[PDB]
Structures are given as C-alpha cells and as structure tokens.
Amino acid sequence: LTPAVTTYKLVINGKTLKGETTTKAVDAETAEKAFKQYANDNGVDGVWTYDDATKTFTVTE
C-alpha cells in the first residue's frame, strides 16, 4: 500500500540469500509494476506479491 507519492520497500528471496531494494509509487499497483519490471528483467518471477507484515513487497520462486 502506497498512500500518495511515497516510497515502498521490496525484498527478493533470490535463491539462497535475501536482499532488499526500494522504489517509489502512487498506488500499490504502481509499486508492483515497477518492482516486477526489475525482477522480471533479471529472471525471478514465481510468487510475486506484497507483504502487510511490515509494509514491504516480495518475490519468491
């Protein structure tokens, strides 16, 4: 969830290690699209959705 024009956070559960990156969005949808673009490009697209247990976003395989 992104209130207005704020930044959101996204964690990648890569393969063995996990790292965090962030991006800015307007609405939750916006955030997802931006984060997805980046992760898709790379090649990590399985379970790609968000977290509401510390307002982060996440991608797992």
Side-chain angles (χ1 to χ4, degrees):
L1 299 176
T2 306
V5 51
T6 311
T7 181
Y8 203 68
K9 300 171 174 290
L10 165 277
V11 293
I12 311 291
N13 185 185
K15 179 185 179 298
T16 304
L17 185 65
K18 174 178 176 296
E20 185 179 301
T21 53
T22 68
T23 201
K24 287 69 62 180
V26 176
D27 182 284
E29 302 303 314
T30 303
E32 185 177 288
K33 293 296 296 73
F35 282 132
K36 187 185 186 303
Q37 182 65 192
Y38 312 138
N40 184 71
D41 178 67
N42 188 56
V44 196
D45 193 309
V47 183
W48 215 164
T49 327
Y50 107 109
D51 167 73
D52 194 273
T54 300
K55 67 290 301 183
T56 286
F57 217 109
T58 190
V59 67
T60 300
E61 300 298 289

